């Protein structure tokens, strides 16, 4: 409520409870080429020299899925380049002093990245001897889509990096946060230790101060509870992961429809070339395989304008995750919102199938009581003198008539020259004169 | 269906593991069909002397697409015996007979369901151990209680258990005599027979017409354990049969060795879409 | 000639005697049958 | 409509049966119905009396066969080609999508591919991508050669140029502080 | 029936299309706006919205005025007529 | 019936793609205002 005389009420917390927000960015899609003429005339010597009549419609196919895959490796490419870190700090097994980072490497990837591979349910994609495996085994299941490739002639690419790199550039930024977040300009890099970054970034927009800092390893605990809590749930309820499977799924469906769509007739007596030829005469022959053929180039044609729409989706959310590293991992962020819920504390992030998964750890206050508090605080003998709280409130302790307390948690303290600033004179400060605070005695 | 009741197996491949949908011949969910029961004749004392049966021969059906039928669902428990209520045995399974044909009318006295030109007729013999099918042309007898003669009720079919179920010797062409008492059997195509195992298990039979020709198809001698339909048999009827109707049959039994007979539910078919649940094994365990 | 060669498709798409770094991906390989394999009915004949 | 057919006569003198030929590619005429792949001895899945097992895609995955046995048929297989062209040099290499070097040969003459002719050198080199021809395996790293094969390799062209050399792409650490 | 030519809200339940509602009230999303005006003045006059000052309007004001369009104390408060022009701009919107 | 077929599909193919086309074009107007979405949220939390 609001009051009616000089005073007005305050509202501050008493808890700390460190939540963690974690969010996913999609930053690619995977690549795909299509081989047109295998596609369309499986082997068939009659049907391709048929489709000689359509030369350019297998061009232009070709040169759009060979444009979108470059474009995907030129963003991977770019999006690497601000992912880096110009110094780092090395990671060693005991990195947060008495905060828990599992974000550490066994001996590669990390725990939480692991786990995060394989709890999602993708497909092998076998890059390195995936044409042996598919008749040494065969379709392992229903829809084996990454093995419908060497038959229906399409073709999935491998990605750009390793999953080694990958982990390198994702490790180096791991072990720069505590160092480039702590000053101003990424120009010079102080190797301190990651409590001391904590402490600083609670110290600082968390408003909480030196005091209580010092006062508490509960806040560790806190920390530590937090992130534990986190690595349970990559269930259904998680809606990140969900997003994640949702990636997954629509590459999925992408090759799905394109397995899918050989066994279509389009009208005609089969959807098998061979079965035309053998049943049919040349002049209705050619009639009946026309039919497969046209209907073959429209669904590979609407394949690659939805390859096209998914690409340039997925280049401008490839902006959106730059745009997070830069502003949410390197540095500590005032914007409400944009990084995660409550105050923007720590983020972290590692790669996700098709993307990047970040982490953000954020202060979350939760027991308000009230209170009432001063404007400001000028001398009764000397109205000109006056003060007023630096990122904090001046309180009527009712327990000195004034005390000092931070902006982000409740405990009150002496006022000095170190939590004020003095200020000229106003209507709605306090003239007090029996007990006066050390900033304002002469 | 969840019980993947009365399902046609798809005619030429199987699958496993997957879920697929179908179109065929289905019948519907919850439908309950017409059932169907079968009586001891009237003993008196050591001589059966008269036939008890329901009105079944008058009631012509249509055959649109076929039929499924489920036989012997209530064996193996205890149930009352038609002719004496009081009375209470234990269920045994009996199997249906069925006449068929492409014309229908009435008999001498107006009755009606006499059917005209070549008839295809499904009798069990032998106890219920084979299966005749046979296709022609009826000629009623004249005689006491006999369709072409006086006091005409309605024919059926009979077995005595006392003489033509001594075990180990079976007579296997009783209730096909009974059958020719009443009838003439008069230019026909075929007679086919088809053993059956005896046994007291829940069967299913069903009936198609394809210019192929008639399909029988049966739940023995494919998933006996389970209740999948698998064809067994194509018949020479190229006429479209468009009518048919349930024969009657009664037992020639003793008060001592009178015993209840469990009803067969008859479902019809229509061309529906289905979701069929193939488990790894490829039997149909599911459907919707 | 464009069928001569793998390169040669390259610039017969392209429409162009100086194709780019182009880095395509070409027509596949498919194998050969090495046999052929018959089953069907033994020792019946349809019956006219 | 039948798992039985009705076929023409033929000679019967052949060597068209499964088990002799299992393991590579065979056209087949099992019945009514035929095609290309390849038959491998495989534990029986389906109904034994509906001889065709099929998938949800409505082709075949297996077959009961007369001998007695269930092959389960496996779609006779493509490699993927890609080439790798510097157009500077006028250099280019091959790279055999991702498959095995053993399964390629210096005329490819157990494949089809109605291309007349394949590209000259003057052996298969194995990569984390697949097999190529053309290349040379060097011990370099690079930031860069503008020819990517994936998985962090690279092909570095020269600067009568010789054959394109195997690269891989270096992670270029920070200053460790 | 049609209220006018081309009811397409009423040509629904004809040609075989639906509307459906929207997932919040009227009122919900009253409340919800309602609320975010009841913050202005007391979230954006310090850090880090973990505590709410309920200072009034035009207290709120005058800081942001001292601040970004930086205007010192001796002229906001040397000044009412900043609400007279602030009711001017607020006015003159709700005409056009 | 034999041509009653043959003009009832007519109709059933031209309202099946009219229909096809008015669902793409709402998945488009969907994406758009799923971003626009975002940007009122940025625009709440940093200007109101």
Redesign the interface.
Do not use: L, W
């Given at each position: 409520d609001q009051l009616n005389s000089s005073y007005f009420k305050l509202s501050i917390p008493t808890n700390f409870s460190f939540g963690v927000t974690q969010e996913y960015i999609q930053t690619t899609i995977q690549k795909v080429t299509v081989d047109c003429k295998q596609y369309v005339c499986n082997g068939f010597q009659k049907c391709e020299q048929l489709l000689r009549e359509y030369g350019q419609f297998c061009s232009k196919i070709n040169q759009a899925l060979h444009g979108a895959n470059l474009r995907q490796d030129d963003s991977v490419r770019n999006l690497f380049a601000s992912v880096k870190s110009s110094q780092s700090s090395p990671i060693i097994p005991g990195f947060g002093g008495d905060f828990n980072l599992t974000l550490l490497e066994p001996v590669a990837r990390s725990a939480i990245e692991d786990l995060l591979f394989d709890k999602v349910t993708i497909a092998d994609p076998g890059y390195m001897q995936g044409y042996d495996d598919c008749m040494q085994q065969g379709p392992a299941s229903?829809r084996d889509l990454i093995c419908a490739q060497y038959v229906a002639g399409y073709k999935v690419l491998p990605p750009l990096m390793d999953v080694n790199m990958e982990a390198a550039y994702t490790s180096s930024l791991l072990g720069s946060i505590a160092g480039v977040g702590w000053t101003a300009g990424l120009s010079s890099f102080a190797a301190i230790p990651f409590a001391q970054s904590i402490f600083y970034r609670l110290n600082g927009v968390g408003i909480t101060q030196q005091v209580l800092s010092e006062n508490q390893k509960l806040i560790a605990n806190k920390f530590n509870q937090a992130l534990g809590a986190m690595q349970t749930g990559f269930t259904t309820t998680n809606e990140a992961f969900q997003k994640v499977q949702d990636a997954v799924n629509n590459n999925a469906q992408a090759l799905s429809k394109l397995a899918s769509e050989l066994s279509n007739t389009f009208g005609a007596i089969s959807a098998s070339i061979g079965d035309i030829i053998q049943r049919l005469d040349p002049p209705e022959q050619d009639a009946q395989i026309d039919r497969l053929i046209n209907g073959r180039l429209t669904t590979l044609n609407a394949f690659v304008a939805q390859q096209l729409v998914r690409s340039e989706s997925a280049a401008l959310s490839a902006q959106l995750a730059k745009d997070k590293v830069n502003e949410c991992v390197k540095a500590q962020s005032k914007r409400s919102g944009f990084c995660g819920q409550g105050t923007h504390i720590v983020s972290f992030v590692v790669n996700a199938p098709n993307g990047l998964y970040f982490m953000h750890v954020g202060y979350y206050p939760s027991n308000h009581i009230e209170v009432v508090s001063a404007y400001g605080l000028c001398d009764a003998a000397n109205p000109t003198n006056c003060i007023a709280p630096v990122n904090g409130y001046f309180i009527k302790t009712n327990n000195d008539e004034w005390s000092y307390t931070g902006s982000s948690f409740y405990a009150p303290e002496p006022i000095t020259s170190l939590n004020t600033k003095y200020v000229a004179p106003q209507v709605t400060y306090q003239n007090i004169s029996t007990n006066l605070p050390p900033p304002l005695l002469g | 269906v969840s019980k993947a009741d009365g399902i046609i197996?798809?005619?030429?491949?199987?699958?496993?593991?997957?879920?697929?949908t179908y179109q065929g011949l289905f019948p519907y969910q919850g439908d309950h069909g017409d059932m169907y029961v079968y009586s001891a004749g009237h003993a008196t004392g050591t001589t059966p002397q008269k036939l008890f049966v329901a009105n079944y021969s008058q009631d012509v059906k249509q055959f649109a697409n076929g039929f499924v039928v489920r036989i012997g669902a209530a064996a193996n428990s205890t149930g009352t015996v038609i002719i004496s209520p009081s009375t209470s045995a234990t269920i045994r399974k009996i199997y249906p007979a069925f006449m068929l044909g492409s014309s229908v009318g009435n008999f001498s006295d107006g009755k009606m369901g006499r059917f005209f030109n070549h008839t295809l007729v499904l009798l069990p013999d032998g106890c219920g151990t084979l299966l005749r099918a046979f296709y022609c042309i009826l000629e009623p007898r004249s005689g006491n209680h006999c369709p072409a003669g006086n006091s005409y009720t309605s024919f059926a079919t009979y077995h005595t258990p006392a003489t033509d179920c001594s075990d180990g010797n079976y007579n296997r062409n009783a209730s096909l005599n009974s059958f020719k008492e009443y009838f003439n059997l008069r230019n026909c195509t075929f007679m086919y027979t088809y053993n059956i195992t005896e046994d007291e298990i829940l069967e299913w039979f069903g009936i198609t017409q394809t210019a192929?020709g008639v399909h029988l198809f049966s739940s023995r001698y494919?998933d006996l354990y389970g209740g999948n339909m698998?064809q067994f048999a194509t018949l020479p009827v190229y006429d479209t049969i468009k009518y048919y109707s349930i024969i009657p049959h009664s037992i020639r039994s003793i008060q001592s060795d009178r015993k209840a007979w469990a009803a067969f539910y008859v479902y019809k078919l229509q061309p529906l879409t289905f979701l069929l649940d193939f488990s790894?094994?490829?039997?149909i365990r599911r459907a919707i | 000639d464009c069928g001569f060669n793998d390169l040669s498709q390259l610039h017969c798409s392209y429409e162009s005697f100086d194709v780019e770094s182009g880095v395509y991906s070409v027509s596949s390989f498919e194998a050969k049958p090495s046999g052929s394999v018959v089953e069907q009915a033994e020792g019946v004949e349809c019956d006219f | 409509?039948?798992?039985n057919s009705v076929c023409p006569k033929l000679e019967f003198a052949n060597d068209t049966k499964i088990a002799s030929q299992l393991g590579n590619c065979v056209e087949y005429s099992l019945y009514g119905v035929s095609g290309r792949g390849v038959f491998q001895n495989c534990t029986a899945?389906?109904?034994r009396?509906?001889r065709?097992?099929?998938?949800?895609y409505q082709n075949l995955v297996?077959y009961y066969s007369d001998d007695g046995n269930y092959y389960c048929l496996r779609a006779c297989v493509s490699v993927p080609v890609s080439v790798i062209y510097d157009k500077e040099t006028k250099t280019h290499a091959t790279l055999f999508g991702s498959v095995a070097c053993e399964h390629i040969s210096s005329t490819m003459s157990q494949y089809s591919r109605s291309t007349r002719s394949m590209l000259k050198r003057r052996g298969p080199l194995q990569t984390p991508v697949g097999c190529v021809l053309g290349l040379v395996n060097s011990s370099l790293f690079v930031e860069d050669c503008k020819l990517p094969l994936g998985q962090s390799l690279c092909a570095l062209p020269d600067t009568v140029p010789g054959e394109m050399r195997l690269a891989s792409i270096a992670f270029n650490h920070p200053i460790q502080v």
């Open positions: 229903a | 197996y798809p005619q030429g491949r199987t699958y496993s593991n997957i879920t697929i192929q494919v698998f790894v094994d490829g039997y | - | 409509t039948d798992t899945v389906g109904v009396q509906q065709f097992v099929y998938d949800a297996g």
